[PDB]
Design a protein around this nucleic acid. Structure first.
Lengths: 169, 31, 205, 25
RNA sequence: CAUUGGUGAGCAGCGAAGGAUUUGGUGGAUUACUAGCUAAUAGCAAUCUAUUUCAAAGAAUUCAAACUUGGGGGAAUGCCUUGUUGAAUAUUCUUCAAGUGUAACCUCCUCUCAAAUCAG
């Protein structure tokens, strides 16, 4: 706050008001930056499940290796997390702790999906289009920008009919 | 019936799998 | 057809078919021949609701102006259709114009009930109702939030982080007394023609 | 008349000069 | 030539003491209307103060009490638990260990994308 002195610095050794270790580097915000989520708690709504993936992924790694329940339940985990598309691959088991990020589940968000498909120019313009009521996922026009869309639902996002932005393209 | 502490582990892991099934399929918006 | 169909329904004669496109327009198709018989319009006469979190008015909202279920009458001469709206519709088949439009439920806590929202609730930034009021409950359990963000018709009520949409899934006619029942968001509703079953006590002390 | 995508504006790690990692330039 | 483009002139045409546009403010509805305040059976509303105070009634988990924690490690230093030691008077406190003990306390993750550009 002050560009404080050489004599001030050594006395205020451990203090900070901007980057804290309980504030965990403001890492969440950098994901709230890159994916433009409205509320903060959407991050911790993913990150409260994201450890819950690992909390099952860890203790299923603690079973004996050719336990015939263990390889079956892990396949049931991985086909589920591959249907929702939150990991790129499913062949390895190691993505269940390495690829399960908040950004990976957060790049399965709806404006990320439209932002990939280049219906929109930027990310936030797709959020503005969902807010304007221009988009639909198969049957239903969705109002919410924070839609978790699976891999198999990804073909169902179109523009909504009779709009002013579907005639724009 | 495999091992009684592994029985405990299978039951607890199935409980967490059921909780994860709940939060993920609700998160899947069951479509 | 030229637009995205769903919720198919046949006449009992099986020579004509009711179709619901994404435009809302129900079409009737011949089956002994291939051409279209005639099409009845539903994008005009559907009561749709604007949610409290909607950012567009209901007059140009594309939320619920199609039909998720269609059923022919037991003459094949009428049709009751129902969708994700507050509106259930009774079209005549050969005269091709709706007979009566039905509310399923008139509830503020149900989301798409109201056509026009009250502007006293539209505050500076935000709705007046979209503020999280679960955090002020006396009980710990009601103060606990388990709502995953973008759950649409998922498992439990509390996890939409929304009001429930007024939607009607399934629509059928009775054979006998032309009564139609539709299982709504609220539950199974029964309309009938069994009139004067309203019980009427006479000369009460 | 409120703009769409009313987002929670919060701490920018790449723009806030209060950060000493961005105290240089 | 279609201009199905508007400018631009105009005219037919419409046409009652102007027409057309744009916006500020406020009020009214936007759920189905039984009055305001207070200490409330009553008093107030020009006032409850020099009756508002006595009176009664009014005290359990003998200490139940994070239903709330991103996930791994560990968890030194703390705490918890019992094991174990001393002191005071059947209990606190000194001392000490054992705890794949632990929302204190240390690190690793919970950022690097068929988004674009760029050499080949």
């Amino acid at each position: 706050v002050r560009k404080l002195k050489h004599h001030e610095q050594k006395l205020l050794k451990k203090v900070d008001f901007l980057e804290w270790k309980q504030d965990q580097g403001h890492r969440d915000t950098q994901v709230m930056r890159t994916y433009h989520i409205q509320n903060r708690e959407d991050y911790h709504k993913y990150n409260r499940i994201c450890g819950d993936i690992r909390r099952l992924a860890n203790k299923l790694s603690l079973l004996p290796p050719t336990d015939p329940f263990r390889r079956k339940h892990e396949q049931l985990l991985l086909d589920k997390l591959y249907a929702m598309g939150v990991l790129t691959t499913k062949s390895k088991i190691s993505d269940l702790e390495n690829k399960v990020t908040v950004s990976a589940i957060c790049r399965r968000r709806l404006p990320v999906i439209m932002h990939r498909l280049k219906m929109a120019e930027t990310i936030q313009d797709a959020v503005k289009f969902i807010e304007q009521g221009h988009v639909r996922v198969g049957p239903n026009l969705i109002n919410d920008p924070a839609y978790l869309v699976t891999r198999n639902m990804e073909d169902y996002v179109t523009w909504v009919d009779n709009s002013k932005i579907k005639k724009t393209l | 019936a495999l091992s009684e502490e592994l029985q405990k582990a299978h039951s607890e892991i199935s409980e967490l799998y059921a909780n994860l099934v709940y939060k993920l399929d609700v998160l899947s918006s069951v479509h | 057809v030229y637009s995205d169909v769903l919720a198919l329904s046949m006449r009992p004669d099986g020579k004509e078919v009711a179709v619901s496109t994404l435009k809302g327009q129900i079409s009737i198709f011949n089956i002994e021949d291939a051409k279209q018989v005639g099409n009845i319009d539903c994008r005009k006469d559907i009561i749709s609701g604007r949610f409290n979190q909607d950012r567009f008015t209901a007059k140009n909202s594309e939320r619920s102006k199609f039909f998720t279920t269609i059923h022919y009458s037991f003459d094949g001469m009428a049709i009751v259709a129902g969708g994700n709206n507050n509106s259930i519709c009774l079209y005549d088949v050969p005269n091709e114009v709706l007979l009566k439009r039905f509310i399923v439920s008139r509830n503020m806590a149900l989301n798409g009930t109201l056509e026009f929202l009250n502007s006293k609730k539209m505050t500076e930034a935000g709705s007046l109702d979209l503020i999280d009021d679960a955090g002020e409950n006396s009980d710990l359990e009601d103060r606990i939030d388990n709502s995953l963000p973008g759950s649409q018709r998922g498992g439990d009520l509390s996890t939409r982080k929304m009001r429930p949409e007024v939607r009607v899934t399934s629509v059928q006619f009775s054979p006998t007394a032309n009564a139609f029942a539709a299982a709504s968001t609220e539950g199974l509703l029964i309309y009938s023609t069994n009139d004067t079953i309203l019980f009427d006590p006479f000369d009460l002390d | 008349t409120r703009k769409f995508g009313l987002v929670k504006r919060t701490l920018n790690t790449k723009k806030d000069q209060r950060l000493k990692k961005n105290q240089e330039n």
